[PDB]
């Protein structure tokens, strides 16, 4: 179940190892447009929050 668009939810994620190769193995995606960073170099950075 996902939250409705009028009252959505947050989920604070911290203190792990983030791998984004598991993201592409879900479905044929409608879009993957990204603004600040690149999808290919996502697995070579460390994030504050």
């Amino acid at each position: 179940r996902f939250a409705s668009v009028y009252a959505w939810n947050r989920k604070r994620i911290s203190n792990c190892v983030a791998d984004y190769s598991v993201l592409y193995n879900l479905a044929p995606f409608f879009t993957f447009k990204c603004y600040g960073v690149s999808p290919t170099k996502l697995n070579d950075l460390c994030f504050t929050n």
Partner: protein, 49 residues
């Protein structure tokens, strides 16, 4: 270059390099005028000596 896609990266550094390029161009542009001023002072100093 650790975070951007190779299609957008040369556009971004294209918009980044030319600012410092014109900065160095303006630096040498004032340097030529300053060198001309001290040259005009140095010819007067040589005439006085």
């Amino acid at each position: 270059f650790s975070r951007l896609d190779p299609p957008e990266a040369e556009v971004q550094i294209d918009r980044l390099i030319t600012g410092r390029l014109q900065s160095l161009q303006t630096y040498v542009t004032q340097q030529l005028i300053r060198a001309a001023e001290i040259r005009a002072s140095a010819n007067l100093a040589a005439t006085k000596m």
